[PDB]
Amino acid sequence: QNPQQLSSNLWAAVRARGCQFLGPAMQEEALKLVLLALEDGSALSRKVLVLFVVQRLEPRFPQASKTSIGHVVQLLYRASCFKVTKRDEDSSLMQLKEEFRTYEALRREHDSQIVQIAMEAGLRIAPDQWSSLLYGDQSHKSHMQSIIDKLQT
């Protein structure tokens, strides 16, 4: 019902699932760096994916850390964005699935997972507040409405 609490309850739900949203400006840049590493089909351990991202993000966003970026990667993992190759005694490697090798499609699956988390947590958030929470503006409402429509069958 009440908006300012919907927001703190959303981000606590996200964090309860081992995930993080870093804020609209920082999330967008973090997601572009994941794409920069993985859009060509490269296959990176979780460790090296995090290192690539943190090292390129931290200069513009000095609070970036391996912990916080690991949480962002977990969100994409929960969203089923990666093909994971398991290697027994060796670290698993992660690639972006082909479908998610462009920013708009990756960011859509990311946002959709956050809406799914809100639904799991019993939080009823309208497209305008979604646009505010994920983009910091009122220009992504039709995008958010499309995600909601698709999650109600």
From Swiss-Prot:
| Tissue specificity as recorded in UniProt | Widely expressed, with highest levels in lymph node and thymus and slightly lesser amounts in brain, lung, and spleen (at protein level). Very weak expression in heart, muscle, and kidney (at protein level). Expressed in CD4(+) helper T-cells (at protein level).
Q: Where in the cell is it found?
A: Cytoplasm, P-body; Cytoplasmic granule
Consequence of gene disruption: Mutant animals are born at Mendelian ratio, but die within 6 hours after birth. They displayed a curly tail and malformations of the caudal spinal column. Lethality can be rescued by changing the genetic background from C57BL/6 to outbred CD1, which allows about 4% of the animals to survive to adulthood. These animals display enlarged spleens with a trend toward increased numbers of eosinophils and monocytic/macrophage populations, dramatic and selective expansion of CD8(+) effector-like T-cells.
Query: What does altering S91A do?
Result: Decreases CDE RNA-binding
Q: What is the effect of changing R60A?
A: No effect on CDE RNA-binding
Looking at the record, which segments are called ROQ?
4-153
Result after altering Y77A? Decreases CDE RNA-binding. Increases target-mRNA expression
Comment field on protein domains: The ROQ region is required for CDE RNA-binding. Has 2 separate RNA-binding sites, one for CDE RNA and the other for dsRNA, both sites are important for mRNA decay. ADE RNA-binding involves an extended binding surface on the ROQ region with a number of additional residues compared with the CDE RNA. It may also be involved in localization to stress granules.
Q: How does it assemble?
A: Interacts with DDX6 and EDC4. Interacts with CCR4-NOT deadenylase complex. Interacts with RC3H1; the interaction is RNA independent.
Quote the function comment for this protein: Post-transcriptional repressor of mRNAs containing a conserved stem loop motif, called constitutive decay element (CDE), which is often located in the 3'-UTR, as in HMGXB3, ICOS, IER3, NFKBID, NFKBIZ, PPP1R10, TNF, TNFRSF4 and in many more mRNAs. Cleaves translationally inactive mRNAs harboring a stem-loop (SL), often located in their 3'-UTRs, during the early phase of inflammation in a helicase UPF1-independent manner. Binds to CDE and promotes mRNA deadenylation and degradation. This process does not involve miRNAs.
What more the UniProt record tells us is: Treatment of C57BL/6 males with ethylnitrosourea led to the identification of the sanroque mouse strain. Homozygous sanroque mice develop high titers of autoantibodies and display excessive numbers of follicular helper T-cells and germinal centers with pattern of pathology consistent with lupus. Sanroque mice reproducibly develop intestinal inflammation in the small intestine but not the colon.
Q: What is this protein called?
A: Roquin-1
Q: Which organism is it from?
A: Mus musculus (Mouse)
- What is the phylogenetic placement of the source species in the record? Eukaryota, Metazoa, Chordata, Craniata, Vertebrata
